[PDB]
Write a protein that binds this ligand. Structure first.
Ligand SMILES: [Cl-]
Ligand SMILES: [Cl-]
Lengths: 311, 326
């Protein structure tokens, strides 16, 4: 079973899954301390519920909210929006690119215990348990980011929950992360190398897939061209790695961690929001001759295999 | 009137005040996300209540908790502890040295609105209103820190609530801060240059006091004398004795600036923003905690000949004039 913000669900209930999404990209405590930044908490909820309902009408049944503590994850917001929209949401532990001092002063052992707390006991006082570990790194893995990756590997090994990563400021970087994960004994089948659609180096992606890594082609609408990114899905299929592909939008319904009103810029480029993958990418792949069964394998079978805790 | 975490109080109820303290030094959301870092939330509460009750027995009536959003201020914690210790706690808005992206990407106008929300409306959904603005800078004021200082000045001028500062990694920064504050029209009498006991430069201290600034001599117990083999203690607490800090109080009194002095411990009952278990190091250095000032500094200054009326002026009259909005 897979833990969601409304409790455990069985694999058969997961359905069509977007594996790299957010409700809100923010900072810890910020939605509670300045909800007016987003108009109001009520306005953010209404926008997220409409957006998730739109995705649900296009076939989505589950999203993975990869927001960590330091990206302002508010699991009570996620639970409210999940219930209102009837879309499952998997919550995350881990560390993104803006850890406060109380996180970035910590050792690998301490970070391991924090991730384990959020997976095994629950997030804050809610009883909601994380179902994924998210780690972000920058170009050249910093000493702290290496501790995070090792703590994530150790928490995954103790719980079976998967790890999803990405590299900021670089079109590659999966090899750095893979070497650290493998040094810890982590299986590549527990790891998605995310934002992999930001490179055109197909031999780099094929080599990671051949080692058993999942390839996150999950920023498709952020080409602000999306068709070129989406053709990477067909190319990995043609190489025989359909089972290794995860697809998503990397979307959100509010954002405070960048410039003011960046949400408006994003919405203007991708008015489909979370429905961009099912409404645009899936029909595009079908028009290119990808069979429905292969598309269902990528959007349903692969995410369930990835998310199912597997020791 | 002065807003506290139990509601508003009159000047006469403020009493003996510690003007630069914290209940917990942390990060936003951290106490709620990982309370076991502090043993538990319940243990932290008990430790803070015991500590504040001991300060109260020694005469303390009010503390100013200068914890900001980004230092992990948890106003519900402050309220629980204020009520059980029966000690007034003034809460803070502002920005410390670890703003997350959602804060450090903001403009001076946005920061001003945030501070005004916490002073005029309330903190989070609690209705508890801040009674002071806390700002921290690093050596040379950074562009973002200048926005913080300007927004603090604008919020103080709109609300009458005072501003308290400190500089990290430099024993002097008040002259740079003061220039910015005065460029915004802020009266120096609404500003405390905090942690001014980090320097022995009397010329610097007296010139600020002569301009009407309050001088925060407010880290008095902090000293790593005897802990030379603990590099993290020396960096946090310094190599000067508590007596050396305290005699800056005498020195400003002797130069005629008794009314410009604010005194405190800069203590706390939990800390996660530094090295693990650093609370144990601080506690070994000053087992009296927040009671250090009334129990050890006040008698010390009496032994050096300062009249009791002068010490009462510094610990009661000055903080009340400072905190009262104007
Ligand atoms: Cl992310
Ligand atoms: Cl502080």
């Amino acid at each position: 079973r897979i833990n969601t913000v409304r409790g455990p669900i069985t694999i058969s209930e997961v359905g069509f899954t977007l594996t790299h999404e957010h409700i809100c990209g923010s900072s810890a405590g910020f939605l509670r301390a300045w909800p007016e930044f987003f108009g109001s908490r009520e306005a953010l909820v209404e926008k997220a519920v409409r957006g998730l309902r739109r995705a649900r009408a296009a076939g989505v049944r589950t999203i993975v909210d990869v927001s960590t503590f330091d990206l302002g994850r508010d699991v009570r917001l996620l639970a409210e929006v999940s219930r209102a929209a009837d879309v499952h949401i998997v919550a995350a532990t881990g560390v993104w690119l803006d850890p406060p001092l109380s996180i970035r002063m910590r050792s690998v052992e301490e970070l391991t215990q924090f991730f384990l707390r959020e997976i095994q006991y629950g997030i804050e006082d809610t009883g909601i348990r994380a179902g994924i570990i998210k780690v972000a790194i920058t170009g050249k893995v910093t000493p702290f980011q290496e501790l995070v990756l090792r703590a994530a590997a150790r928490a995954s090994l103790a719980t079976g929950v998967p790890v999803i990563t990405h590299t900021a400021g670089s079109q590659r970087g999966g090899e750095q992360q893979a070497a650290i994960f493998e040094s810890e004994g982590l299986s590549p089948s527990r790891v998605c190398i995310g934002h992999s659609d930001e490179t055109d180096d197909l031999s780099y992606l094929t080599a990671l897939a051949a080692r058993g890594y999942l390839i996150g082609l999950d920023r498709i609408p952020h080409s602000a061209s999306w068709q070129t990114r989406a053709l990477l899905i067909k190319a990995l299929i043609d190489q025989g790695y359909m089972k290794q592909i995860l697809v998503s939008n990397d979307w959100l319904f509010g954002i405070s961690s960048y410039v003011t009103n960046f949400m408006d810029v994003m919405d203007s480029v991708n008015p489909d929001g979370m429905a961009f993958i099912p409404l645009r990418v899936i029909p595009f792949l079908r028009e290119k001759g990808i069979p429905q069964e292969t598309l269902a394998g990528i959007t349903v079978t692969n995410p369930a295999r990835f998310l199912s805790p597997t020791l």
